[PDB]
Design goal:
The complex is a heterodimer.
Chain A: E1 17-21, E2 27-32, E3 38-43, E4 45-50, E5 56-62, H1 73-91, E6 100-103, H2 109-115, E7 123-125, H3 140-148, E8 153-158, H4 169-185, H5 187-195, H6 213-235
Chain B: E1 2-5, E2 13-17, E3 20-24, E4 32-36, E5 42-48, E6 56-60, E7 67-72, E8 77-82, H1 86-98, E9 103-104, H2 113-118, H3 123-129, E10 138-141, H4 147-151, H5 177-182, H6 185-197, H7 200-217, H8 220-234, H9 241-257, H10 263-266, H11 269-277, H12 286-295
Parallel strand pairs in B: 4-9
Antiparallel strand pairs in B: 1-4, 2-3, 2-5, 5-6, 6-10, 7-8
The chains are: A alpha/beta, B alpha+beta.
The structure holds 3-[(2S)-2-amino-1-hydroxypropan-2-yl]phenol.
């Protein structure tokens, strides 16, 4: 069934599972033509496939050449996503293959189900959570590798850096979703919070700064302030 | 013209023969139905006055034997049986015909309704869907489940309709996932028509039989099958033109005959709105769209 607040610790048990977010697969800019009509120009996108227990992120980069000569691109994007997720699962050793795949948007259910018919024992699930994974392209290193790609490419990351050395998966996921919600609601402010202090750096092999435990509590508090605020600045409260 | 005699009518019952029906009182001197048109399958069906639960009945073709109905007080139902003694049967029918103890199949000369509803329905195919090989006629009732329903529990008592499943390996060619899911022509023309049914006449026969079991017995799995077979055609971009024209006629007469007060449970809103207004064939069912819009505009 659908994933929601009730069954939230299920994400951190020992059954392998992946989230799939297709938001950033088909990305366009909209512009005027010389005749004054409107046109789109595609830019590189990505599939965001995340193991919430381990932090392993399979970032499949979607190069604009995929769309050349195709029609109904927003529909094709869902099927391309499902094809690539299916190919990823098939590439993994049997003992690494997920038991469930949770899609962040219900329109991915039928494309993924049809692509995964060969895997009847892998459950394809929606969620009632409104997860902020679209903001993944606000993470500078992720945006950089997507925009620089000249061909289709899969890049592997750990979106938790080394956090699991000190905190549980539950806490790591909560931190991630807080950071991404912040970046989604007010990217500039969120990014200022994360980099304001020049002495805390991002290691070459990491995505986020090297905060101490104490500094993460301060950071997390600042992100919560931001989100509640913008929720005022938005709804005037 | 053929006859289905009745030994007696010991319990009060509403008896249907095809699209007609009449009430028989407990122990009324009723001895059967005469003047049944030759050339068509027929269904004779029963709803007891005490227990409207379980409509049940029998599909038969009078060219295949002499059939009669007798009430079984142990099993509590009207049973069809075959009479092997042709001289005894002719004598039994003549005596009752002389005593005017039979209702006449009440067909209006102008009226092609039953033909139009059963055009492609053959007894031999019915007998493969309803497996009881020792009899020439087939029993169906409101509660029988379909083979596909049993996969999702007595197999001898099932409706073995052809399984249709749009999210299945049979329906979806590896490497054509999107193509085959959004345009079901492969599954319609290659898998089902060329492979399983062999021609469109057998496809339409099963479609018509499913509808008739849905309408006459309220059989839910039959209704599911009817809608699935419609949806498979309408969701195919490539369908032989003669098939589309024939489907429009078939569905027109089905919608025309449907009791208005049962449209709520016998018509699937999603399938019909998709078929008539969104599918590849949205513009190919003129007669059916016109009667649906004038008889059931609420559903749409
Ligand atoms: C009563 C009886 N079982 C035997 O005469 C019967 C009734 C009607 C038609 C028949 O062939 C047989």
């Amino acid at each position: 069934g659908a994933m929601n607040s009730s069954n939230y610790a299920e994400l951190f048990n020992n059954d392998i599972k992946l989230f799939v977010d297709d938001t950033n697969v088909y990305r366009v800019t909209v512009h005027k033509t010389f005749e004054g009509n409107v046109a789109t120009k595609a830019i590189n996108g990505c599939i965001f496939t995340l193991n919430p227990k381990t932090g392993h992120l399979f970032l499949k980069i979607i190069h604009t050449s995929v769309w050349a000569g195709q029609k109904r691109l927003s529909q094709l994007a869902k099927w391309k996503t499902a094809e690539e997720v299916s190919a990823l699962v098939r590439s993994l050793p049997k003992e690494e293959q997920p038991k469930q795949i949770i899609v962040t948007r219900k329109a991915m259910l039928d494309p993924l189900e049809v692509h995964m018919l060969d895997f009847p024992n892998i459950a394809i699930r929606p969620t009632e959570l409104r997860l902020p994974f679209s903001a993944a392209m606000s993470i500078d290193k992720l945006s950089d590798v997507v925009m620089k790609a000249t061909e289709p490419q899969m890049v592997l990351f750990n979106i938790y850096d080394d956090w699991l050395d000190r905190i549980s998966s539950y806490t790591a996921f909560s931190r991630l979703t807080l950071l991404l919600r912040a970046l989604k609601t007010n990217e500039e402010s969120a990014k200022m919070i994360l980099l304001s202090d020049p002495t805390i750096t991002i290691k070459s092999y990491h995505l986020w700064p090297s905060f101490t435990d104490e500094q993460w509590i301060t950071i997390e508090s600042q992100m919560r302030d931001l989100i509640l605020t913008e929720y005022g600045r938005k709804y005037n409260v | 013209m053929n006859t289905v005699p009745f030994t007696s009518a010991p319990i009060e019952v509403t008896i249907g023969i095809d699209q007609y029906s009449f009430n028989v009182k407990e122990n009324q001197p009723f001895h059967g139905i005469k003047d049944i048109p030759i050339g068509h399958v027929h269904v004779i069906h029963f709803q007891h006055a005490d227990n409207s639960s379980m409509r049940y009945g029998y599909w038969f073709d009078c060219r295949m034997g002499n059939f009669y109905i007798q009430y079984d007080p142990k099993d509590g139902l009207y049973k069809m049986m075959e009479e092997r003694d042709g001289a005894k049967f002719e004598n039994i029918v003549h005596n009752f015909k002389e005593r005017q103890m039979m209702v006449s199949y009440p067909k209006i000369d102008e009226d092609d309704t039953w033909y139009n509803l059963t055009e492609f329905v053959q007894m031999d195919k019915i007998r493969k869907i309803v497996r009881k090989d020792e009899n020439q006629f087939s029993y169906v009732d409101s509660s029988m489940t379909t083979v596909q329903e049993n996969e999702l529990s007595d197999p001898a008592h099932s409706l073995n309709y052809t399984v249709i499943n749009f999210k299945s390996r049979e329906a979806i060619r590896p490497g054509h996932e999107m193509e085959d899911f959004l345009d079901k022509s492969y599954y319609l023309n290659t898998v089902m028509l060329q492979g399983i049914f062999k021609n469109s006449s057998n496809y339409f026969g099963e479609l018509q039989f499913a509808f008739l079991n849905a309408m006459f017995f309220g059989n839910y799995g039959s209704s599911l099958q009817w809608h699935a077979m419609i949806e498979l055609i309408c969701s195919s971009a490539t369908v032989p033109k003669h098939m589309l024209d024939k489907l429009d006629e078939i569905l027109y007469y089905q919608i025309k005959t449907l009791p208005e007060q049962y449209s709520d449970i016998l018509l699937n809103e999603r399938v019909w709105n998709i078929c008539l207004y969104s599918s590849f064939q949205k513009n190919s069912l003129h007669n059916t769209e016109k009667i649906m819009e004038n008889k059931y505009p609420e559903l749409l």
